[PDB]
Design a binder for this molecule. Structure first.
Ligand SMILES: NC(=O)C1=CN([C@@H]2O[C@H](COP(=O)(O)OP(=O)(O)OC[C@H]3O[C@@H](n4cnc5c(N)ncnc54)[C@H](O)[C@@H]3O)[C@@H](O)[C@H]2O)C=CC1
Ligand SMILES: NC(=O)C1=CN([C@@H]2O[C@H](COP(=O)(O)OP(=O)(O)OC[C@H]3O[C@@H](n4cnc5c(N)ncnc54)[C@H](O)[C@@H]3O)[C@@H](O)[C@H]2O)C=CC1
Ligand SMILES: NC(=O)C1=CN([C@@H]2O[C@H](COP(=O)(O)OP(=O)(O)OC[C@H]3O[C@@H](n4cnc5c(N)ncnc54)[C@H](O)[C@@H]3O)[C@@H](O)[C@H]2O)C=CC1
Ligand SMILES: NC(=O)C1=CN([C@@H]2O[C@H](COP(=O)(O)OP(=O)(O)OC[C@H]3O[C@@H](n4cnc5c(N)ncnc54)[C@H](O)[C@@H]3O)[C@@H](O)[C@H]2O)C=CC1
Ligand SMILES: CC(C)(C)[C@H](O)C(=O)O
Ligand SMILES: CC(C)(C)[C@H](O)C(=O)O
Ligand SMILES: CC(C)(C)[C@H](O)C(=O)O
Ligand SMILES: CC(C)(C)[C@H](O)C(=O)O
Lengths: 276, 278, 278, 278
């Protein structure tokens, strides 16, 4: 029954729309997405899914019950000025934009109607295979059932939980950027397999299966990742020799550096936006 | 395969992980599984008992019970248990060695002193078979029948990915997907430390980091695109992800994971060469 | 036994540390202990004398006094004193070698040239036996009776942790708990320097750093949880500890301690290889 | 006093650790302790309840129960609970803030708006109070009576080392002994990895590494000698320990621990600067 809109018909709109329709929670034709350029590739893929496309953001707003903001963060103020007069009391406005605060969104929208229902979320591209990692925070006028509705919807495409808004920039550096850390690691592990004599295709398949299985083990275990590691490492054995060379390069410190750098850049960009 | 009895020589981490995976998959009833260990007071033995798996101190009883016999002892114990139960191997047995490094030829040579034509398969797997997401390769031995490889692939596919390989790939597979979960646990612990540094509670940071790794791995498995293209899709221009990828690159992140696979593979080969010297 | 007599061949640091621990524990009166060194002017010799330990320059006299005979000379002197005292070993003697690296085989070979069936135990301990918090492992030799191992474990448990191991673990134990105290002394000196840099008086910084290390070690010994979980409990999100852990990780702190255990273990094995060649 | 009543505002890790230590020491019966948290479903809340500690969601009830009132909430919550309970502080109350970074000045300013002359003590402790081996410092506030400091030192000495300091030392103490246990847990995990690399079972490696750290720390606390002298006594010429110390030095081991104390102390000061601005 629910009509869903995406302002911005790009990578994230495609990923969510694919996940929602694969989950069977939405019919593709009950989704509408808008972008200025109707000839983009993401738009073609959405079109082939059966999603409704239009260049006009107002049509997306008028179609939608739940309205996702899926444009780049510096575009958010422009489209809020554009469609703010079109937001109705029935709308739930879900901002997916990195860094952009609920306060900044409500300030724009409240100049039109007084009580906009805003939810901010951070998700990631694996919603496309229904294994996303999603957090959300509720705005000033978001009703209790608004947050419940959004958790049910986003749980259909992965993990979803409510957070205080002040955690979301850190979540962005961990699970928002996290898939890229994983793709980098998987490319490098495959190079390692190839160096040691494996065909590339097998090395890619085995590395990716190893990462998936290990992540699932941790999610299903009550034990600390160090204990799961201890269970792998036999005394004198192959694994503990390999963990040593990771440690000698400061492997752990690089991943900490990465989360920190993505979080800090997220905060720094929003600081630029608020100054502007 | 209801007519199939499965046994484990060794009742430790891998025997538990496989028995838990097989029974969760429904391909084996736990009472059709027997496992043996000289220490019936181990945490893995207690876990196997509560599953319904039959337990005995005596390896000979495992052999007599089993059709498919998994060798799940440490690699240096393999020649001792081959000498112990070699005279008990029957024509019906398929011997599946899971031991790192240990060659099919060394196993066949030991068993053939007792009865010619032992049916031997060598595999390398990993602990995530316990959640039915293992990564398993196997190589068939000299006297393994064609049906033996198909049978073993059917059984091991129920607990994850499984494919046949030439034996000379297995030591490298060991360094990639055998040791792989440990690389992942290390990475996930570090990613969680990063989440905590930036203000997340530890439990949430662990959950999100693990989910991000799982989802990305599944994306790559289900996509036709290169990991670099999927990575390019994450990084917006000027954005948070590309800033983070730069600091990974500045530390030689990629080279460390190459070093790891290499070090595990080389150690695997080194240990077997020491065993072959003995 | 409260009638048991104990001897040390080599009245140096370890003989002092064990004798101090045994007597502080009350398991031995100092007068049941005899120690021998060629130089009766050593400081360790004077310290033992003040405790009430019997001293002599003659290793034969220590052998005649003793039931349990500790060998506490430097490893390259072990063959020399075995040649000197071998004809004086009796049926009643338990010979306990504390020497790093020196194998039970090499000791039994020297002593068996004089008299068959020497009862030999090899141990590795560490200096904190002086405060009854040592870490000790032992392996029993070919002719040690079952009660010899139990007696030695009872004695050494009075001054710290003590457990039986296979002899092939002892060189690795040497690199971990034998050299271990030196790693801790280095760490405590540096932690104190950090406290001083941030404005603490040296005496307070030393006291707090050592207390923190002691308490943390005791927590781990008394906990069922992984050290990573205990570390996670210390680290509040965004907080001081997680910031400090990051700078440790950026320097490869963990890899340095792995390097250290490895280097001590490898050196221990290399030194014994040189002795065996000679 | 055996009539003294103790309260914890914030029934989390530190409240559990202190309550466990106080009761294990016998200085307080569990029923003289009350702790409050807004979520009565927390694991720390259940652990305290099993010990016999009184629990309530209402911070006012803890204040009414208590003579000595510990503030054991996260630092940014301190101003919130001072506003909540300030009108309930009485002449009899000793308010002991355990919060990292939070100054006596800021606490006395909030409480004095309700009632003049609050008796305030600030402390910094660490988690090993749970095994009665904490490291604790305290500074007395403007209106603390002389016996208030003595009472607090007597109480906190029951669970470890405790001494009075000037308040301007506490942020540095935080970086040394407050974060200290986490440095030790990291070191012990890595030492165990080294033991495992060289062939030790994990459980034995963890046990020996922790015992070595504990014993070394106890040696230093009981010795009059410099940690460098104790280190010198471990290092035999040409031997295993001095080889291992070299590889520590080549990685700048000492500098990493200095970096850590500094980073924790600086972060502690920075967090309080942010609070003071707010
Ligand atoms: N891609 C992901 O997996 C995730 C992205 N996000 C957030 O989602 C938002 C979009 O990310 P992507 O989809 O990656 O960027 P993208 O660049 O692929 O798509 C952006 C879309 O906005 C469209 N657009 C530009 N100007 C517009 C306007 N005036 N009106 C309407 N549409 C307009 C562009 O044509 C394009 O279709 C960003 O704020 C990003 O931070 C958050 C979580 C993960
Ligand atoms: N743990 C893993 O994830 C994987 C392990 N492997 C291989 O599986 C084998 C076992 O690995 P884990 O189970 O991790 O070792 P583990 O040490 O947990 O279990 C070893 C078992 O062998 C038993 N055992 C010792 N001597 C025995 C004897 N004479 N007869 C019967 N049982 C005896 C021990 O009591 C213990 O139950 C090794 O060869 C390892 O390389 C292969 C791939 C993955
Ligand atoms: N110091 C420690 O905490 C530990 C030391 N060990 C082992 O204990 C043995 C000695 O260690 P330290 O006491 O540190 O050495 P140390 O050099 O302090 O004492 C060695 C003693 O042997 C004496 N000695 C030299 N030639 C002798 C002879 N011909 N007959 C009798 N005594 C003779 C020396 O005079 C000196 O008193 C070494 O093999 C060392 O590996 C093992 C574990 C811990
Ligand atoms: N954990 C340790 O070993 C040490 C901690 N500290 C300090 O102790 C304080 C707490 O440390 P942890 O116990 O580790 O924190 P924790 O987070 O484990 O426990 C904090 C407790 O405060 C409770 N809380 C939250 N809002 C509250 C409210 N409005 N009223 C009452 N209780 C409330 C939480 O529910 C939780 O039970 C912090 O200021 C920390 O700096 C100082 C020295 C050592
Ligand atoms: C799975 C593997 C054989 C690599 C194990 O982790 C080991 O190190 O022995
Ligand atoms: C998901 C995320 C917002 C982190 C995106 O990958 C970006 O870098 O802009
Ligand atoms: C004990 C300490 C206050 C340093 C805590 O571990 C933290 O990091 O907040
Ligand atoms: C205890 C030990 C044998 C390791 C001594 O410290 C040495 O280096 O010789």
């Amino acid at each position: 029954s629910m009509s869903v809109g995406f302002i911005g018909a790009g990578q994230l709109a495609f990923a969510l729309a694919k996940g929602f329709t694969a989950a069977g929670v939405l019919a593709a034709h009950k989704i509408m997405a808008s972008s200025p350029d109707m000839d983009l590739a993401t738009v073609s893929a959405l079109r082939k899914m059966g999603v409704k496309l239009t260049p006009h953001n107002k049509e997306t707003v008028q179609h939608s019950d739940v309205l996702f903001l899926a444009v780049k963060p510096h575009i958010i103020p422009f489209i809020l000025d554009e469609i703010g007069a079109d937001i109705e009391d029935r709308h739930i406005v879900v901002s997916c934009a990195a860094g952009v605060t609920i306060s900044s969104i409500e300030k724009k929208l409240s100049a039109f109607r007084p009580a906009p229902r805003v939810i901010r979320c951070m998700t990631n591209t694996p919603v496309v295979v229904r294994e996303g990692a999603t957090v959300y925070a509720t705005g000033t006028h978001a009703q209790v059932e608004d947050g419940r509705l959004m958790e049910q919807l986003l749980s259909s495409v992965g993990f979803c939980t409510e957070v205080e808004e002040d955690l979301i920039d850190a979540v962005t550096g961990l699970s928002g950027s996290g898939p890229a850390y994983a793709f980098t690691a998987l490319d490098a592990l495959a190079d390692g397999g190839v160096k040691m004599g494996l065909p590339r295709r097998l090395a890619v398949r085995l590395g990716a299966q190893a990462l998936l299985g290990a992540a699932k083990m941790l999610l299903h275990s009550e034990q600390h990742p160090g204990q799961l590691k201890d269970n792998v490492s036999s005394p004198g054995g192959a694994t503990i020799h390999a963990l040593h060379v990771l440690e000698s390069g400061g492997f752990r410190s690089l991943l900490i550096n990465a989360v920190e750098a993505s979080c800090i850049r997220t905060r720094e960009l929003q600081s630029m936006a608020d100054q502007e």
